[PDB]
Amino acid sequence: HHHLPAEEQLALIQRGTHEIISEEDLLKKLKENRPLKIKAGFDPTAPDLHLGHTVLINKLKTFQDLGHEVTFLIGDYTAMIGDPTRPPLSREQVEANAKTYQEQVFKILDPNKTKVRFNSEWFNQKSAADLIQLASQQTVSRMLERDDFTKRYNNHQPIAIHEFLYPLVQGYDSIALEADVELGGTDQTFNLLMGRTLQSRYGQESQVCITVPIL
Ligand X SMILES: N[C@@H](Cc1ccc(O)cc1)C(=O)O
Contacts with Mg ion, residue ranges (CB under 5 A): 117-118, 121
- 74 φ, ψ to 5°? -95, 120
Angle of CA points 184, 101, 35, to nearest 5°: 55
Burial class (CB in 10 A: 0-12, 13-18, 19+), 10: middle
H or E element at residue 128: helix 128-135
Query: 135: how many CB neighbours lie within 10 A of its CB?
Result: 13
- Cβ distance to ligand X smaller for residue 32 or 145: 145
- Cβ distance to Mg ion smaller for residue 112 or 141: 112
Q: Residue 123 touches which of Mg ion, ligand X, none (CB < 5 to 8 A by kind)?
A: none
- Cβ distance to Mg ion smaller for residue 73 or 183: 73
As measured in angstroms, the least distance from the Cβ of 130 to Mg ion is: 18
As measured in angstroms, the least distance from the Cβ of 182 to ligand X is: 7
- Cβ distance to ligand X smaller for residue 119 or 138: 119
Q: Residue 41 touches which of ligand X, Mg ion, none (CB < 5 to 8 A by kind)?
A: ligand X
Cα separation, 180 vs 68, whole angstroms: 10
Q: Residue 118 touches which of Mg ion, ligand X, none (CB < 5 to 8 A by kind)?
A: Mg ion
As measured in angstroms, the least distance from the Cβ of 191 to ligand X is: 6
As measured in angstroms, the least distance from the Cβ of 133 to Mg ion is: 22
- 20 φ, ψ to 5°? -140, 105
- Cβ distance to Mg ion smaller for residue 25 or 182: 182
Residues that bind ligand X (CB under 6 A): 41-43, 73, 75, 119, 170, 173, 191
Closest C-alpha among 192, 198, 195, 200 to residue 19: 192
